Amino acid sequence: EWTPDKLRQKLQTNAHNRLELPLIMLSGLPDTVFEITELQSLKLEIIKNVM
Amino acid sequence: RIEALPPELFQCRKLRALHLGNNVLQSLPSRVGELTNLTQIELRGNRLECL
């Protein structure tokens, strides 16, 4: 469901001038998120049971 | 680590993209009103008292 292009669409900035990925109410954390290496900040909101 | 912005910076008029964010700029001088080519300026963070 989360292609890297979708993550490019999700890419934004935050209150501290960092590259933020807003992930909202997800089932988990995809490895496609970690495939992005230019990322400066991670936003995980109510994504529980995540390793 | 720039504490004060010199007026000689604003003496030039061709500035367009001022990446001045996340600094220790105490304040931005009013001489930025001289700048016309400035289409974007990063002022987030810093010690900016007021714009």
Curated annotation (Swiss-Prot), chain A:
LRR repeats lie at residues 2-13, 14-36, 39-51. Induction: Induced during the earliest stages of adipogenesis. It comes from the Eukaryota. Expressed at very low levels in adipose tissue. Signal peptide: none annotated. Disruption phenotype: Mice do not show remarkable changes in body weight or the weight of white adipose tissue on a chow diet, but display significantly lower body weights and fat mass than wild-type mice when fed a high-fat diet. Moreover, improved insulin resistance induced by the high-fat diet is observed. It is found in: Cell membrane; Endoplasmic reticulum membrane. Non-essential component of the volume-regulated anion channel (VRAC, also named VSOAC channel), an anion channel required to maintain a constant cell volume in response to extracellular or intracellular osmotic changes. The VRAC channel conducts iodide better than chloride and can also conduct organic osmolytes like taurine. Plays a redundant role in the efflux of amino acids, such as aspartate and glutamate, in response to osmotic stress. The volume-regulated anion channel (VRAC) channel forms a trimer of dimers, with symmetry mismatch between the pore-forming domain and the cytosolic LRR repeats, a topology similar to gap junction proteins. Belongs to the LRRC8 family. Heterohexamer; oligomerizes with other LRRC8 proteins (LRRC8A, LRRC8B, LRRC8D and/or LRRC8E) to form a heterohexamer. Homoheptamer; inactive, likely because it is not targeted to the plasma membrane in the absence of LRRC8A. In vivo, the subunit composition may depend primarily on expression levels, and heterooligomeric channels containing various proportions of the different LRRC8 proteins may coexist. This is Volume-regulated anion channel subunit LRRC8C. The gene is Lrrc8c.
Swiss-Prot record, chain B:
LRR repeats lie at residues 14-35, 36-51. It is found in: Cell membrane; Lysosome membrane. N-glycosylated. It comes from the Eukaryota. Disruption phenotype: Increased prenatal and postnatal mortality, growth retardation, and multiple tissue abnormalities. B-cell development is slightly impaired, without affecting B-cell function. Mice however show a cell-autonomous early block in thymocyte development and impairs peripheral T-cell expansion and function. Conditional deletion in germ cells leads to abnormal sperm and male infertility: the cytoplasm of late spermatids appears swollen, preventing reduction of the cytoplasm during further development into spermatozoa. The volume-regulated anion channel (VRAC) channel forms a trimer of dimers, with symmetry mismatch between the pore-forming domain and the cytosolic LRR repeats, a topology similar to gap junction proteins. Heterohexamer; oligomerizes with other LRRC8 proteins (LRRC8B, LRRC8C, LRRC8D and/or LRRC8E) to form a heterohexamer. Can form homohexamers in vitro, but these have lower conductance than heterohexamers. In vivo, the subunit composition may depend primarily on expression levels, and heterooligomeric channels containing various proportions of the different LRRC8 proteins may coexist. Interact with GRB2. Interacts with NOX4; this interaction prevents the ubiquitin-mediated degradation of LRRC8A. Belongs to the LRRC8 family. It is linked to Defects in Lrrc8a are the cause of ebouriffe (ebo), a spontaneous mutation that causes male sterility. Spermatozoa present in the epididymis display severe malformations, mostly of the tail. A drastic decrease of the spermatid population is observed, whereas spermatogonia and spermatocytes seem moderately affected. Defects are caused by decreased volume-regulated anion channel (VRAC) activity in germ cells. Oogenesis is not affected but embryos derived from ebo/ebo females show early developmental failure. This is Volume-regulated anion channel subunit LRRC8A. It comes from Mus musculus (Mouse). The chain holds residues 719 to 769 of 810 of the full protein.
